[PDB]
């Protein structure tokens, strides 16, 4: 790999510089190199990895949605024929998005998840596995769509089981996992009632645990609780 000759600490240092410069493709490549050094990742390092790829795939997903919309319009009644270009370019962006998802999933499988033993790291990585299968599911249309969806579900479910046993209801990772699993139910699995029930129960159980928290932790938790509330207001 092109990062094989750079020190682990230098890769982390440059990942932080890339974030400051909003160079998220660079940031992702640096953190991929850090992961490939083979040592487990600290809490801060895990969040550098997630920030980098979240931003990269976020831009690809937004672009895919623009192109997919143009493509759907082109196939309505009365739309003039413009050739294969829209499909081709949507396919180009889709393939690059799938490549990024495959890269993240490959890092999780080789070998982040199997070495992660603490609840905070294991839940974090399983949530990530669910997230990137969900992004694959957003663009899937063929023979493997159902297996892609079930792979996202299974990863989210394993993470949920651990988080409920090992973390308090206000833990930001637990809350973000539940938020995203709820979105999976609503957007991918055609299960809006499950999405709503999960978001409500997660919100209510966190509300009842806020009294245990410091001011700084209270801020961290209520920020994510508001996102659950935003979705409930959108969905109901």
């Amino acid at each position: 790999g092109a990062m094989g000759s750079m020190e682990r600490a230098s890769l982390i240092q440059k990942a932080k510089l890339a974030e400051q410069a909003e160079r998220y493709e660079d940031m992702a490549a640096f953190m991929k190199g850090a992961v490939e050094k083979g040592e487990e990742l600290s809490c801060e390092e895990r969040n550098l990895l997630s920030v980098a790829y979240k931003n990269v795939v976020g831009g690809q997903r937004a672009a895919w949605r623009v192109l997919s919309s143009i493509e759907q319009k082109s196939n309505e009644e009365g739309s003039e024929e413009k050739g294969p270009e829209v499909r081709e370019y949507r396919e180009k962006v889709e393939t690059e998005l799938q490549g990024v998802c495959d890269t993240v999933l490959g890092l999780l499988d080789s070998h982040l998840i199997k070495e992660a033993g603490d609840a905070e790291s294991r839940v974090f990585y399983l949530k990530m596995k669910g997230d990137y299968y969900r992004y694959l599911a957003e663009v899937a249309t063929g023979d493997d769509k159902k297996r892609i969806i079930d792979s996202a579900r299974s990863a989210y479910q394993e993470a949920m089981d651990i988080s409920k046993k090992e973390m308090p209801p206000t833990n930001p990772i637990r809350l973000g996992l539940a938020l995203n699993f709820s979105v999976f139910h609503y957007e991918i699995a055609n299960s809006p009632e499950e999405a709503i029930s999960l978001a409500k129960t997660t919100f209510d159980e966190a509300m009842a645990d806020l009294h245990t928290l410091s001011e700084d932790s209270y801020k961290d938790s209520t920020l994510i609780m508001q996102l659950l509330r935003d979705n409930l207001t959108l969905w109901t």
């Binding site: 997230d131 973000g176 938020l179 979105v183 609503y186 957007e187 996102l227 659950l228 935003d230 979705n231």
Partner: peptide
């Protein structure tokens, strides 16, 4: 709007 995720 869009669904919130984190």
């Amino acid at each position: 709007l869009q669904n919130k995720s984190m």
